[PDB]
Amino acid sequence: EDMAKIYGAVAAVSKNVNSSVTYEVKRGTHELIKVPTIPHNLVLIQSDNGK
Amino acid sequence: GEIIYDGGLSSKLADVVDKTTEPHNADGAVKDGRIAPVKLDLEKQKLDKL
Numbered sequence: 078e079d080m081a082k083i084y085g086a087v088a089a090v091s092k093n094v095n096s097s098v099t100y101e102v103k104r105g106t107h108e109l110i111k112v113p114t115i116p117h118n119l120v121l122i123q124s125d126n127g128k
Numbered sequence: 129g130e131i132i133y134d135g136g137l138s139s140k141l142a143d144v145v146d147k148t149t150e151p152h153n154a155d156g157a158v159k160d161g162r163i164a165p166v167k168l169d170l171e172k173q174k175l176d177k178l
Contacts, residue, residue, distance in 0.1 A: 096162035099151045104171040 153160040 092161050092163075094162050095166070096153055096160065097151075097165045098168055099165045100168040100170040102171055104173065 151165050153162065153164055
């Protein structure tokens with residue numbers, strides 16, 4: 078019985094080993110919007126007689 | 129005539145999980161005694177908790 082306790086404690090220590098890490102790489106990334114129209118900013122000014 | 133062979137249950141070699149799976153260690157025939165991969169909340173954009 079006391080041997081099972083000693084053997085169990087050793088197995089607990091051996092099981093404390095770490096395997097790996099996992100993380101997401103998202104820094105520096107931004108979403109993109111879509112502009113549907115082109116701004117021209119033009120107006121045609123014409124006289125009444127058209128000259 | 130009498131039928132000897134007409135087919136049957138066919139064994140498939142691979143089971144291809146058609147869905148995204150989070151990282152995991154060995155389970156099944158080989159069981160991994162090491163700790164599971166640690167999920168770290170890194171590369172935050174807005175600065176929280178600092």
